[PDB]
């Protein structure tokens, strides 16, 4: 009531004094420090009357930048720092195809070689970290290693692998079952069936892993505070005192991950 | 100098006291909005007196990180994800250049290797995607390929093209009109007139595209999105 109003007025006076002190301290600094501002980074951005068509189930990290004419299929994911600039031409990410951290997918100017085609990444493909894609046509069920660079004109066929740290030269086709790699990107060896199983399992594991990141990067301020309080409260445990009190403190469901992301599916 | 640093530190002390007072005033009123974990990233970050000098007609992406003494010419562009960190020395970026997406142009972090050479970028210079320029110096009207890893002490002459994926070793000069590629970088072929014309036109194409991206980035922040994020149930 009256006490609450008085305390509110005192708080207003204290806030005013604090802001005045902040301004004075900024003046003494010589106005050399550039003040932090509200975030102006747009996750999804239009360029030329063109909008991305990100699907409902896609996980697009807040630090990612899906720009221009980008079409992303169900179940796929775009991870932190990844850039998909489709301003000049089209980029079509398939279903289940995840583009990993700091990866760049950019399409050519439709005339880099005269008969350029858009970047068509297929289904269930996985692209490694820091990879660079500049106009490829990666077919479905493929693997691009981390750090690999695919120049314009290349076509990674189905069930083919590009080794990490490779440079696929322009107009180079990787046949099915090969593991082409190296800076010249020459033939290395044939793929075993275990490698194919590994590719499929990695794609499915990343599909299952994108869900917890999506559920964590979209929480509101109120939910974040509650989860932080619960995490602090259950960080350390004391079974002796709980047994002495006859209680059993159990971790809340908000701090439990699905068993499909644990190393071996640990229920207990 | 040393006198300025003392005033800067006293400024931090007074600003910290003022922020603490503001937080205390918020707590008396029951508000706790200062606890929000907002991103502290600044596209232009200063280190004491060293602050980036960016021309007015230069596109700098909001996610690009420019730190220290960095000079950007008119018509240049720093695209998404770039990290231009020059603190021990200066990073000079010319006019008409285009640091493309997820590229790194930084200077050495210590004097142990010797002297920290400033990074100089000419005019109409095309830096490729994910290219790491570490203390080199490129002349104008040159092209740096995608994934290139130019090291320090490197001079790339006028009309010189560094092939994609190449790694130019320390203290290497690329002669004018020659293409150097591979690991380590070695002479491969001489540039043709058509490639020179394409290099000239790519700079203008990216300069025009950066204007459109800047226009789309200068629009007022959407209020519908802000309201939607505020109410999440």
């Amino acid at each position: 009531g009256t006490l609450g109003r008085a305390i509110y007025t005192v708080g207003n006076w204290i806030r005013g004094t604090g802001q005045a002190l902040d301004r004075v301290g900024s003046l003494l600094q010589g106005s050399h420090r550039i003040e932090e501002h509200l975030s102006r980074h747009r996750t999804l951005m239009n360029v030329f009357d063109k909008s991305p068509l990100v699907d409902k189930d896609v996980f697009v990290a807040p630090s990612a930048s899906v720009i221009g004419d980008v079409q992303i299929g169900k179940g796929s994911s775009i991870w932190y720092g990844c850039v998909l600039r489709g301003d000049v031409n089209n980029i079509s990410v398939g279903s289940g195809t995840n583009i990993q951290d700091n990866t760049l997918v950019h399409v050519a100017k439709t005339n880099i070689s005269g008969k350029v085609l858009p970047t068509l990444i297929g289904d269930n493909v996985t692209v490694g970290h820091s990879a660079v894609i500049h106009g490829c046509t990666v077919e479905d069920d493929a693997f691009v290693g981390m750090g690999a660079t695919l120049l314009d004109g290349v076509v990674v066929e189905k069930h083919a692998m590009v080794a990490a740290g490779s440079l696929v030269k322009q107009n180079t086709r990787i046949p099915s079952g090969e593991v082409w790699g190296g800076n010249p990107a020459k033939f290395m060896r044939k793929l075993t069936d275990e490698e194919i199983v590994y590719i499929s399992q990695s794609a499915k594991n990343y599909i299952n892993l994108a869900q917890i990141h999506a559920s964590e990067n979209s929480k509101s301020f109120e939910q974040i505070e509650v989860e932080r309080a619960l995490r602090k409260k259950y960080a350390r445990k004391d079974e002796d005192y709980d047994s002495m009190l006859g209680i059993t403190r159990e971790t809340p469901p908000e701090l439990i991950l699905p068993d499909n992301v644990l190393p071996g599916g640990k229920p207990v | 100098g040393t006198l300025g640093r003392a005033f800067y530190s006293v400024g931090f002390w007074i600003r910290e006291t003022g922020q603490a007072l503001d937080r205390l005033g918020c707590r008396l009123q029951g508000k706790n909005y200062f606890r929000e974990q907002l991103s502290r990233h600044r596209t232009l970050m200063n280190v004491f007196d060293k602050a980036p000098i960016v021309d007015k007609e230069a596109f700098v992406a909001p996610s690009a990180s420019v730190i220290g003494d960095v000079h950007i010419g008119r018509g240049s562009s720093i695209w998404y994800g770039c990290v231009l960190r020059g603190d021990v020395n200066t990073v000079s970026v010319g006019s008409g250049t285009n640091i493309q997406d997820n590229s790194l142009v930084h200077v050495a972090k210590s004097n142990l290797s010797g002297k920290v050479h400033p990074t100089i970028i000419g005019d109409n210079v095309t830096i490729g995607h994910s290219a790491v320029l570490h203390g080199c110096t490129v002349e104008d009207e040159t092209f740096i390929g995608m994934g290139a890893t130019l090291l320090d002490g490197v001079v790339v002459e006028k009309h010189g093209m560094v092939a994609a994926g190449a790694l130019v070793r320390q203290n290497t000069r690329i002669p004018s009109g020659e293409v150097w590629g591979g690991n380590p970088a070695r002479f491969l072929r001489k540039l043709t007139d058509e490639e020179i014309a394409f290099i000239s036109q790519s700079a203008t194409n990216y300069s025009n595209l950066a204007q459109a991206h800047a226009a789309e980035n200068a629009k007022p922040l959407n209020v519908i999105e802000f309201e939607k994020v505020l109410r999440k149930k």
């Binding site: 609450g4 509110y8 007025t9 708080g11 | 029951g30």
Partner: peptide, 30 residues
């Protein structure tokens, strides 16, 4: 919204103000 709602927190603020004022008076009156 010019009202502090938490009654318990308001009493803590009053007690802190009283403690500061009393400490100042104690250091001055004696």
């Amino acid at each position: 919204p010019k009202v502090s709602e938490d009654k318990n927190r308001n009493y803590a603020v009053v007690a802190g103000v009283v403690a500061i004022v009393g400490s100042i008076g104690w250091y001055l009156k004696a």
